[PDB]
């Protein structure tokens, strides 16, 4: 009667952006990224990757309430680098590692076939 539709976890409303970037002007060079219709699945993957980069000084996320499929990430970088650009770099690295990883599994799989 008050259960929400389960499909609302991944289907984006038309007036709702998948991604929203705002500044945190209290400290220099810090952004708040709000991710809509996403989980720990995506968030934890990006977070660890980012933390091993030398120019990322702070990265964190929280899922504020499990009944709502969103999370918010906070990302601060040193003066040289722009945070939003650094996020793109983290994304492309992981896409590459998974492409490689998919390739090496296929090769090993035929040998056992």
């Amino acid at each position: 009667m008050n259960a929400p539709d389960r499909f609302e976890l991944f289907i984006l409303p038309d007036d709702v952006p998948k991604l929203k970037i705002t500044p945190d002007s209290r400290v220099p060079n810090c952004i708040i990224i709000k991710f809509e219709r996403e989980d720990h699945t995506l968030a934890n993957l990006l977070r660890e990757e980012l933390a091993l980069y030398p120019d990322v000084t702070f990265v964190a996320y929280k899922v504020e309430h499990p009944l709502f499929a969103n999370f918010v990430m906070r990302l601060q970088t040193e003066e040289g680098t722009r945070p939003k650009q650094a996020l793109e770099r983290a994304c492309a690295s992981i896409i590459n590692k998974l492409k490689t990883l998919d390739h090496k599994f296929n090769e090993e799989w035929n040998i056992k076939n």
């Binding site: 009667m1 539709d5 499909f7 289907i11």
Partner: protein
Amino acid sequence: DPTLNKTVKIRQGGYKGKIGIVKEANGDRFRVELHNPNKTIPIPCSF
């Protein structure tokens, strides 16, 4: 209005293919009492 209480099928949206009954037809936005889960939804007339 001539379509209240008549059986309806939904052809677009997340509830596409489901049976229902027109519970209230005030204007443009209908109230279909869906059969499949125990819920009555607001829905546009194009659907």
